Amino acid sequence: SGFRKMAFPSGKVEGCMVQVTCGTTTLNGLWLDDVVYCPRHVICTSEDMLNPNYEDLLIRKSNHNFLVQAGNVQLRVIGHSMQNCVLKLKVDTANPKTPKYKFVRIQPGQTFSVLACYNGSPSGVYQCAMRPNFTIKGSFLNGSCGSVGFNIDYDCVSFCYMHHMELPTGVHAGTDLEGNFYGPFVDRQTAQAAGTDTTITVNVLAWLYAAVINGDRWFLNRFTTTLNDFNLVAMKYNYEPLTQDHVDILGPLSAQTGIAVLDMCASLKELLQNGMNGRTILGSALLEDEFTPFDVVRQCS
Amino acid sequence: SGFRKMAFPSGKVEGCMVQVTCGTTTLNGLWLDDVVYCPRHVICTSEDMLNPNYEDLLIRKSNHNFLVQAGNVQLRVIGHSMQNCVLKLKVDTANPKTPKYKFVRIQPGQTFSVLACYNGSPSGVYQCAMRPNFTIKGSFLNGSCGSVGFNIDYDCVSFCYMHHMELPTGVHAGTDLEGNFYGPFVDRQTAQAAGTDTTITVNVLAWLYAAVINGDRWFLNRFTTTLNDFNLVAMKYNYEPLTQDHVDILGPLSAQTGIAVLDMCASLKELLQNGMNGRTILGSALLEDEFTPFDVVRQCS
Ligand SMILES: *C(=N)N(Cc1ccc(Cl)cc1)N(C)C(=O)[C@H](Cc1ccccc1)NC(=O)[C@@H](NC(=O)c1cccs1)C(C)(C)C
Ligand SMILES: *C(=N)N(Cc1ccc(Cl)cc1)N(C)C(=O)[C@H](Cc1ccccc1)NC(=O)[C@@H](NC(=O)c1cccs1)C(C)(C)C
């Protein structure tokens, strides 16, 4: 019936995206209740970024240097404070669209939807994974700062990502909605680089299960393996060590398919050693690791 | 800055999705103005599908056999007519959320966003391409019939797909919003199969340009080629013949990058012959063809 990388419906967030401008810089903000959250480097000029003292830079700021637009509407800024690396800009109008929302700090390996915007206008929506080195591989051009990642869990909108940075290597980085960077990064134009990316093993397994469910099963073998033995082959190819809790987490998927986690770990073992010999798994010739077990169970059940 | 397969923000459509039930069957519908569009096979039982006479089946229908819910709300059905392969069910309440909308019949090779729903509830959003054989490769489980594909062009919401069918081969099929099937398919449980899928050449080129823009350029060569010569290698690998209009269409992309279409056709020529030798292009080890030139220019500019 198909398996696709898909994003939560984005309506509940489209209505929270506004435009923020300070000096010659314009980017995006998040309008919840009477507050608009955005990245604090909005107040920085080209020269400031090299070594900005944000507290000092912010004092010199008066509310009229901050210009906020809900679509074409304009919002009145009546205060501005800093929380870690995010600008809180209080406004008169509470957003009548504010949804039921949380501010969550996700875990590496977890996934969220990103609503990409340019000048307060939503552009599109896509799913990203928080890599083990606290980066994400998304689509953030000029004017994309302020786009936020989120999950929808039944009632609630869980905001987990606000985009700040791009790294020399093409990957991305940001903060939670309290303003704390994921990873070691700083909002400063100085040398910093990601750690080594390893690969999210439990997700790859989840992806193979998803593929068995959808008819791709050529990679299934009769072998079985032990965690320690597989995890020795894992370590060779920069794969996250698998754990018993990961196996527990994969329970429902192994059940729906009739394949022990450990039987699939042997199938995975063979694919790291020998590659794919020109066959495909769910339309890839590479192994994929940005699907969580939950993401798969949601779509395959 | 990144290139990702992304879908239009889905808010303007989330609010048009309702639940439809007839007998023991429940699926999705599209509530625009005072009308709810859904697939007409909703009125068919297991036995009917084999050879349904829909006109006859529909006469035996009274409005009370049709049950429609906007969320938990219920809508009153005050009429029901058939238009090709879609049920039009008039209702008392005009949707106060009805957007500015068109009903467009897209062209093979063109792309649209699909808002997947299950029992009137939106589940997620993703981008699909109308294959040259009038199928799509999406994610449509039980209760997904009625999910619609759409594009957003500035003001308007262009509805182009409503999902009806799944094919023995795992691929999907449906109608425009006037109820005309794409492809040769019929809403009947009898033998029918897709034509041979060829590959959308102009899209693959667009994808290579997107990859050059984002730093992947190992596949660039010094050679050049002629359309007829490339299109001879195209025909070998079930690739759509390239045309001068496709080259015109790729103009802006070839401009942004400095690579003549024909210089890229030679790079593509080499990749069909020799494959990728274990390198990747925008995180694939395969060539991709579900990006239009427009889809790329939108994200890379
Ligand atoms: C967001 N709206 N925005 C604009 C933007 C610039 C370049 C690209 Cl490719 C896409 C969008 N961004 C990403 C920025 O304004 C940030 C601000 C910033 C944050 C931290 C340090 C410096 C600047 N610009 C950057 O991410 C820049 N990154 C860096 O200079 C560094 C990365 C690691 C160490 S320094 C650039 C290089 C993307 C301009
Ligand atoms: C939509 N809500 N819905 C349910 C559904 C069934 C199976 C799967 Cl895998 C996913 C969802 N669908 C797809 C249907 O109800 C259709 C209705 C239909 C339309 C045309 C012909 C027959 C039935 N079910 C199907 O698509 C079925 N397809 C076929 O029988 C044929 C395909 C080609 C020739 S006959 C099945 C096989 C998916 C049940």
Q: Do B9 and A115 touch (CB under 8 A)?
A: yes
Question: Ligand 2 atom 29: the closest Cα is on which residue?
Answer: B189
Structure tokens at A13: 């967030």
Model resolution, angstroms: 2.0
The single-letter code of the amino acid at A163 is: H
Report how far residue A240's alpha carbon sits from residue A231's, in angstroms, rounded to the nearest whole number.
Answer: 8
What Rg value do the Cα atoms of chain B yield, rounded? Answer: 22
Specify whether B300 is catalytic: no
Report how far residue B83's alpha carbon sits from residue A199's, in angstroms, rounded to the nearest whole number.
Answer: 51
Question: Ligand 2 atom 6: the closest Cα is on which residue?
Answer: B142
Q: Do A11 and B7 touch (CB under 8 A)?
A: no
A291 touches chain B (CB under 8 A): no
Structure tokens at A135: 């980066």
Is B19 touching ligand 2 by the criterion CB < 6 Å?
A: no
Q: Do B9 and A125 touch (CB under 8 A)?
A: yes
Strands, E assignment, chain B: 17-22, 25-32, 35-39, 66-69, 77-83, 86-91, 101-103, 111-118, 121-129, 148-153, 156-166, 172-175
Q: Superfamily assignment of B1-14+100-197 in CATH?
A: Trypsin-like serine proteases (2.40.10.10)
Structure tokens at B53: 């006479």
Range B198-301: architecture per CATH: Orthogonal Bundle (1.10)
Shortest CA distance from A301: residue in chain B: B141
Shortest CA distance from B216: residue in chain A: A170
Distance B1 CA to ligand 1 centre (A): 10
- Domain positions in chain B: 1-14+100-197, 15-99, 198-301
- State the catalytic residue, choosing from A38, A117, A145, A300: A145
Structure tokens at B140: 């449509």
One fold for B15-99 and B198-301: no
DSSP string, A34-56: TEEEEEGGGG--HHHHTS--HHH
Q: Do A1 and B299 touch (CB under 8 A)?
A: no
A4 touches chain B (CB under 8 A): yes
Q: What are the distances in angstroms from CA B231 to CA B118, B223, B254?
A: 43, 16, 19
DSSP state letter for B280: -
State the Cα angle at A283 between A281 and A284, rounded to 5°.
70
Question: 3-class DSSP state for residue A17?
Answer: strand
Residues 6+ apart with CB under 8 A from B147: B28, B114, B115, B116, B117, B140, B162, B163
Report how far residue A206's alpha carbon sits from residue A279's, in angstroms, rounded to the nearest whole number.
Answer: 19
Method: X-ray
CATH number of A15-99: 2.40.10.10
Question: 3-class DSSP state for residue B167?
Answer: coil
Contact B262, B225 (CB under 8 A): yes
Specify whether A145 is catalytic: yes
Distance B165 CA to ligand 2 centre (A): 5
How many of the other CB atoms lie within 10 Å of CB of A129?
23
Distance from CA of B60 to the nearest CA of A (A): 32
Nearest to A148 by CA among A169, A168, A172, A184: A172
Distance B128 CA to ligand 1 centre (A): 31
